[PDB]
Amino acid sequence: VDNSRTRPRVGHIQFLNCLPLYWGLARTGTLLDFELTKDTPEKLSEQLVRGDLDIGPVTLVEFLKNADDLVAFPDIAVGCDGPVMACVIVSQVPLDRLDGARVALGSTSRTSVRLAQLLLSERFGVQPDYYTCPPDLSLMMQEADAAVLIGDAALRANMIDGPRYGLDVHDLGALWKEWTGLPFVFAVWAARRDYAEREPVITRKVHEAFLASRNLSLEEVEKVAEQAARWEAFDEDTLAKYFTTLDFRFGAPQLEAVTEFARRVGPTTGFPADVKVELLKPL
Amino acid sequence: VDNSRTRPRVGHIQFLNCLPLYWGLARTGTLLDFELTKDTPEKLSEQLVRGDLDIGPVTLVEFLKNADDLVAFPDIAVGCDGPVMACVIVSQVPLDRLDGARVALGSTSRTSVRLAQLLLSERFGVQPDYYTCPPDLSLMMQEADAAVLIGDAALRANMIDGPRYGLDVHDLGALWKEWTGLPFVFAVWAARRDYAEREPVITRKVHEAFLASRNLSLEEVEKVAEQAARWEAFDEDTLAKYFTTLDFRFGAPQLEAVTEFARRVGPTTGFPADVKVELLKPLEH
Numbered sequence: 001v002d003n004s005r006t007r008p009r010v011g012h013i014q015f016l017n018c019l020p021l022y023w024g025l026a027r028t029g030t031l032l033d034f035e036l037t038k039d040t041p042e043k044l045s046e047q048l049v050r051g052d053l054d055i056g057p058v059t060l061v062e063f064l065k066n067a068d069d070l071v072a073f074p075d076i077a078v079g080c081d082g083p084v085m086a087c088v089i090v091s092q093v094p095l096d097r098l099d100g101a102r103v104a105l106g107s108t109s110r111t112s113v114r115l116a117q118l119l120l121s122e123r124f125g126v127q128p129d130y131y132t133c134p135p136d137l138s139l140m141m142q143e144a145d146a147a148v149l150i151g152d153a154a155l156r157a158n159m160i161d162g163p164r165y166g167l168d169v170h171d172l173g174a175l176w177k178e179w180t181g182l183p184f185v186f187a188v189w190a191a192r193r194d195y196a197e198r199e200p201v202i203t204r205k206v207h208e209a210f211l212a213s214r215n216l217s218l219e220e221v222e223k224v225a226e227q228a229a230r231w232e233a234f235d236e237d238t239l240a241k242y243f244t245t246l247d248f249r250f251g252a253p254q255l256e257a258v259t260e261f262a263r264r265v266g267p268t269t270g271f272p273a274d275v276k277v278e279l280l281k282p283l
Numbered sequence: 284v285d286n287s288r289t290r291p292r293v294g295h296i297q298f299l300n301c302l303p304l305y306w307g308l309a310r311t312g313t314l315l316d317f318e319l320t321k322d323t324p325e326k327l328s329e330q331l332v333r334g335d336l337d338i339g340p341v342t343l344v345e346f347l348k349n350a351d352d353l354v355a356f357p358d359i360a361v362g363c364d365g366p367v368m369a370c371v372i373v374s375q376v377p378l379d380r381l382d383g384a385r386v387a388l389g390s391t392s393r394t395s396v397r398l399a400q401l402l403l404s405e406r407f408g409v410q411p412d413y414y415t416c417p418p419d420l421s422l423m424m425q426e427a428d429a430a431v432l433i434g435d436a437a438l439r440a441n442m443i444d445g446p447r448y449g450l451d452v453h454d455l456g457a458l459w460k461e462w463t464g465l466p467f468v469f470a471v472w473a474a475r476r477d478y479a480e481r482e483p484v485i486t487r488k489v490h491e492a493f494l495a496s497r498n499l500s501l502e503e504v505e506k507v508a509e510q511a512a513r514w515e516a517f518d519e520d521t522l523a524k525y526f527t528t529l530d531f532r533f534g535a536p537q538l539e540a541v542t543e544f545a546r547r548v549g550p551t552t553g554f555p556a557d558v559k560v561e562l563l564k565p566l567e568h
């Protein structure tokens with residue numbers, strides 16, 4: 001029997017928002033200490049929760065629903081302080097005309113869709129007829145007045161499709177900041193509690209390697225954008241602005257925002273309004 | 284509609300034999316120009332042949348069966364000149380006692396299993412009772428006199444299991460070298476012909492990036508083995524010896540060996556004995 005140690009199974013969001021991080025993991029050689037899995041954020045969260053991954057990114061809403069079973073990594077997250085550029089509401093009408101209107105929710109999202117619902121109800125006062133469908137701006141606009149998108153599809157709606165076809169594109173990060181003055185966190189990195197307790201060292205080394213890879217990705221954002229632009233409708237400048245508008249910090253200001261968002265949606269999203277976020281303790 | 288250009292879909296053998304190359308692809312940043320797929324060599328060959336990949340490693344036997352539809356990359360392959368360490372025959376008896384005996388063939392292999400059959404029949408003169416099964420030395424040894432293994436399972440049989448349980452482990456690379464004096468090639472890198480013709484630049488850049496990643500992996504072999512040893516029953520010295528015993532060249536001497544092997548097995552393995560190997564041509568300037 002081969003009872004040797006086994007690499008941690010690590011999820012990774014396939015979208016552009018984590019492409020610089022993937023660059024960092026590869027350039028540092030960290031990838032060879034992972035058994036990596038790429039998917040969309042809702043799938044990666046499902047996989048970590050059910051045990052098909054040991055460590056990975058978790059969309060915030062799904063993390064809070066499973067907070068007792070997850071240990072969040074400090075000082076890294078997928079967030080924003082103001083605009084996030086790639087979490088948006090695309091609408092053919094002003095937001096105050098969406099009461100009773102058909103609003104499409106991209107299936108790949110769990111946190112942005114909930115944040116959009118929070119804003120429309122509690123900030124703008126509209127009660128739309130929501131439905132979930134795969135992300136597709138062309139099809140969504142034919143069946144609904146507005147659509148909530150994340151990832152590359154939202155970046156394309158914001159940078160390309162919206163301007164071309166004269167559609168309003170609302171940045172969810174900006175709408176949240178206007179309403180609360182706070183930054184926002186869409187996803188955290190977490191280890192399964194059972195894995196963190198079985199392998200405290202590997203979990204710590206994975207966390208430290210993510211920080212080192214994130215730090216390197218910030219320093220070489222220009223190189224990453226140049227290479228990534230060759231395979232996208234986006235150009236180098238647009239990607240570089242997107243990569244640098246994204247906020248990957250996860251300290252006290254970011255937890256402050258998580259706390260307040262959890263309070264406003266918790267009782268209606270399946271976790272206590274005062275849900276406890278357990279963070280990986282340093283040595 | 285997003286009509287932008289799309290990354291080539293590139294296969295990669297998950298075994299240790301291509302772990303240094305994976306290190307190279309990551310350190311150079313090449314991975315961010317690929318849409319990578321990791322699997323075992325027989326699966327990757329099926330995927331490239333059926334069109335689920337654009338470029339990838341192809342076990343030689345499967346490449347030769349589809350040679351008209353594949354374009355091989357020059358100057359990189361998975362081969363050996365003498366021992367390969369991770370393509371073996373594990374046997375409880377001397378090889379000359381395997382006539383009519385049960386011999387198990389690891390499912391993940393296509394070329395080593397054929398080479399083992401060629402050697403046992405044409406060099407040693409035994410006609411065993413072959414059967415194919417998933418790679419598992421413990422299960423294979425209770426049901427058969429000998430077993431053919433590749434990859435990490437063969438490296439484990441050669442370095443650990445064999446010595447512990449007193450089993451003979453024959454290196455297929457060495458047996459071929461003894462018989463012919465030639466090196467051997469187990470897998471090549473190839474692009475689908477339709478993809479190579481639709482995207483000559485991307486194919487060329489992928490080829491050049493593989494060479495650059497391979498070269499870097501050779502220079503940093505010690506680092507790769509140190510890191511990889513932490514997740515293996517093998518130690519740093521064993522991995523470094525394995526990485527440096529592997530021969531990743533694919534030039535005239537290696538093509539010579541491919542030609543002769545194809546000649547000896549072709550008519551009984553589903554391709555002409557004189558099958559034509561088309562190589563990716565470099566650009567004129």
Ligand SMILES: C=C(Oc1cccc(C(=O)O)c1)C(=O)O
Nearest residue numbers: 017059086109110111112151187
């Ligand atoms: C921040 C972005 O989008 C995301 C990322 C992760 C999770 C979610 C979600 O809504 O669950 C959204 C981006 O693409 O920049």
Ligand SMILES: C=C(Oc1cccc(C(=O)O)c1)C(=O)O
Nearest residue numbers: 300342369392393394395433434
């Ligand atoms: C060379 C090794 O094994 C291989 C690699 C690729 C294909 C095959 C095959 O037999 O089809 C075997 C090694 O593991 O070092």
